Amino acid sequence: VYPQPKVLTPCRKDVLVVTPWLAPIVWEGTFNIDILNEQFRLQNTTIGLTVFAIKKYVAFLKLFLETAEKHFMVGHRVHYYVFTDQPAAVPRVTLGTGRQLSVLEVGAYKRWQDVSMRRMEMISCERRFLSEVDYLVCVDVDMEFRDHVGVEILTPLFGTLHPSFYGSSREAFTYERRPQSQAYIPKDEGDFYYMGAFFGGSVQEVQRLTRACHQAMMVDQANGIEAVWHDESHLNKYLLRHKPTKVLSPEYLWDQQLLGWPAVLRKLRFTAVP
Amino acid sequence: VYPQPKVLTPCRKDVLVVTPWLAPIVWEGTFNIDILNEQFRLQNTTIGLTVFAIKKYVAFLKLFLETAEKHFMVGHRVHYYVFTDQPAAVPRVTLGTGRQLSVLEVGAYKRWQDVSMRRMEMISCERRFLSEVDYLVCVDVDMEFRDHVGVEILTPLFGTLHPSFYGSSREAFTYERRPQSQAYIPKDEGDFYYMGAFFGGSVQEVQRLTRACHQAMMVDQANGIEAVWHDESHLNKYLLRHKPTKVLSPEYLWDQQLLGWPAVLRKLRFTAVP
Ligand SMILES: O=c1ccn([C@@H]2O[C@H](COP(=O)(O)OP(=O)(O)O)[C@@H](O)[C@H]2O)c(=O)[nH]1
Ligand SMILES: O=c1ccn([C@@H]2O[C@H](COP(=O)(O)OP(=O)(O)O)[C@@H](O)[C@H]2O)c(=O)[nH]1
Numbered sequence: 133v134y135p136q137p138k139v140l141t142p143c144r145k146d147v148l149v150v151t152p153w154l155a156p157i158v159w160e161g162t163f164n165i166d167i168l169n170e171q172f173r174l175q176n177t178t179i180g181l182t183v184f185a186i187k188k189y190v191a192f193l194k195l196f197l198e199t200a201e202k203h204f205m206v207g208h209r210v211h212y213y214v215f216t217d218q219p220a221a222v223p224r225v226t227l228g229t230g231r232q233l234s235v236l237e238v239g240a241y242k243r244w245q246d247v248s249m250r251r252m253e254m255i256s257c258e259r260r261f262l263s264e265v266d267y268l269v270c271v272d273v274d275m276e277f278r279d280h281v282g283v284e285i286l287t288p289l290f291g292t293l294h295p296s297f298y299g300s301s302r303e304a305f306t307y308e309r310r311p312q313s314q315a316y317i318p319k320d321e322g323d324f325y326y327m328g329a330f331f332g333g334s335v336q337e338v339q340r341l342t343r344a345c346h347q348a349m350m351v352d353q354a355n356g357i358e359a360v361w362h363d364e365s366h367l368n369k370y371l372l373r374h375k376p377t378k379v380l381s382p383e384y385l386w387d388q389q390l391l392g393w394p395a396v397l398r399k400l401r402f403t404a405v406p
Numbered sequence: 407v408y409p410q411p412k413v414l415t416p417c418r419k420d421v422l423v424v425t426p427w428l429a430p431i432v433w434e435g436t437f438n439i440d441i442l443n444e445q446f447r448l449q450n451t452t453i454g455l456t457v458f459a460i461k462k463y464v465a466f467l468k469l470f471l472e473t474a475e476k477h478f479m480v481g482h483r484v485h486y487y488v489f490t491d492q493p494a495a496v497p498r499v500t501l502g503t504g505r506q507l508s509v510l511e512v513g514a515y516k517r518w519q520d521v522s523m524r525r526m527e528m529i530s531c532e533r534r535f536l537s538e539v540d541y542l543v544c545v546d547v548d549m550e551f552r553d554h555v556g557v558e559i560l561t562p563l564f565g566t567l568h569p570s571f572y573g574s575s576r577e578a579f580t581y582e583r584r585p586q587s588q589a590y591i592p593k594d595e596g597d598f599y600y601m602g603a604f605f606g607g608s609v610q611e612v613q614r615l616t617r618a619c620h621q622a623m624m625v626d627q628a629n630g631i632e633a634v635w636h637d638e639s640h641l642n643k644y645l646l647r648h649k650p651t652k653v654l655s656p657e658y659l660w661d662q663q664l665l666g667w668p669a670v671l672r673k674l675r676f677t678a679v680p
């Protein structure tokens with residue numbers, strides 16, 4: 133027993149709720165969470181969440197993890213995978229039932245470009261995700277959850293609209309524009325500008341995507357060019373060619389300090405920390 | 407190179423384009439057919455179309471088939487499966503490249519209820535669909551195509567909004583309301599009223615659906631009740647419990663003689679014949 137959807141009275145008339153390849157764009161008021169929760173519960177869905185916390189970024193884990201417990205996939209099985217050069221630095225956060233955390237120890241890379249960039253490499257570690265989770269969600273650690281982020285996001289492949297470019301035209305998009313880079317996207321192409329900080333999908337699609345992006349980055353290195361926004365550039369080139377089956381609205385990646393809280397955002401769910 | 411989708415200016419503001427379980431509702435202006443065509447071509451998609459033409463309904467095949475050739479999945483591989491008690495009566499219609507037709511001979515059933523109802527049984531013939539097509543589309547024969555019906559419909563499971571109930575409230579829906587019938591749907595439930603004349607999906611999902619509906623009809627027979635709208639009733643009960651991954655708007659099942667051509671319908675694609 134829920135509100136009857138009515139085909140002649142849309143809920144959101146202010147935003148695009150479907151892409152032109154028929155992928156939902158996820159905004160508050162587009163979904164009934166109760167229907168979706170049942171769907172995903174009926175398959176005993178397990179969602180993995182990957183997060184890197186290399187060098188000083190271990191400082192962000194406590195709030196990340198505490199807020200994930202309040203807001204992320206609450207009621208579903210969750211497995212956190214914390215990639216860190218400092219395992220002893222990972223805070224012990226008490227978890228809800230059916231939720232667990234693994235610490236994966238990795239190398240502290242040369243500069244920030246590589247730490248951000250080698251995530252694609254480090255996520256692709258492959259045998260294990262396939263056995264343990266049905267979906268993988270890949271996010272920045274320097275963030276907090278402030279509202280529901282749940283199974284509405286889950287789909288074979290998704291990316292998230294960069295909060296600075298959702299209202300913008302495409303020649304404005306900061307894609308890689310040098311044809312020397314595997315990340316190259318011409319000035320007459322592109323659907324959206326996706327942020328590197330929040331993407332995911334089924335384990336098979338995320339392994340594909342991260343393998344591709346790593347193979348593309350290595351090809352650029354061997355040719356002496358570094359895409360302008362690094363992993364985000366390659367992410368955007370992958371998602372142009374392999375279109376995501378859901379797109380998350382900027383409700384899912386926001387910075388209230390830089391951008392306020394406009395009326396088109398009914399919820400701010402996952403936000404940057406200073 | 408196509409129109410850039412703009413996230414703050416929806417194309418359709420007059421209709422619901424997404425269900426509350428995040429299934430697209432397919433209306434003109436929600437999709438770019440060029441993007442979709444490429445997607446489906448890249449997988450060499452084959453679509454099967456099943457149609458029953460038992461007794462006098464062989465009379466409808468010539469126009470059905472001629473118009474399907476102009477409008478249905480044009481450019482993609484298509485396999486028509488014509489179920490008939492009269493194989494010699496099937497018109498020879500010249501087909502486009504990559505399109506073929508098989509005649510399947512079956513029994514002329516006792517009354518019209520059973521002819522319509524035993525379709526579910528006759529579609530479920532199982533080994534063969536799995537090998538030959540990726541999707542199955544199941545329609546009435548007493549119809550003509552008048553405009554594009556293409557790969558925008560394709561998804562694991564879809565149904566179509568009955569053209570007489572899309573603007574209506576749910577207690578108005580002519581679901582089966584006797585609890586004695588497997589088709590029973592309470593007065594406080596239901597998302598939409600789907601018509602029996604146009605549903606489909608992947609071969610696996612259509613085999614599931616048609617197996618379920620046949621198993622449900624047989625259980626009702628053994629109990630001496632016949633659902634009020636027969637196969638359509640069971641279809642609607644299946645789609646309540648297993649929600650379709652796309653819903654087709656009434657653009658995909660219309661009767662211009664009974665309903666005109668309202669402004670909310672930008673195309674009339676598949677329509678009833680007198
Ligand atoms: O020294 C570093 C730099 C980056 N990161 C990881 O790489 C992500 C992206 O980096 P950052 O957040 O600095 O990029 P921004 O959001 O500022 O563009 C971070 O959230 C961390 O998960 C890290 O763990 N240690
Ligand atoms: O004598 C019959 C009655 C029905 N049908 C098939 O069952 C479908 C549904 O029947 P009908 O079109 O009469 O139902 P309606 O659309 O009038 O509700 C038809 O399109 C045919 O495909 C048939 O082949 N021969």
Ligand SMILES: OC[C@H]1O[C@@H](O)[C@H](O)[C@@H](O)[C@H]1O
Pocket residue numbers: 294296306327361364
């Ligand atoms: O334009 C691309 C850049 O946009 C900035 O706003 C953002 O901080 C960068 O991380 C990168 O996304």
Ligand SMILES: OC[C@H]1O[C@@H](O)[C@H](O)[C@@H](O)[C@H]1O
Pocket residue numbers: 568570580601635638
């Ligand atoms: O209400 C259910 C009935 O609605 C009629 O308009 C239609 O002709 C019937 O075929 C059946 O769908």
Ligand SMILES: [Mn+2]
Pocket residue numbers: 272273274329
């Ligand atoms: Mn960050």
Ligand SMILES: [Mn+2]
Pocket residue numbers: 546547548603
């Ligand atoms: Mn009919």
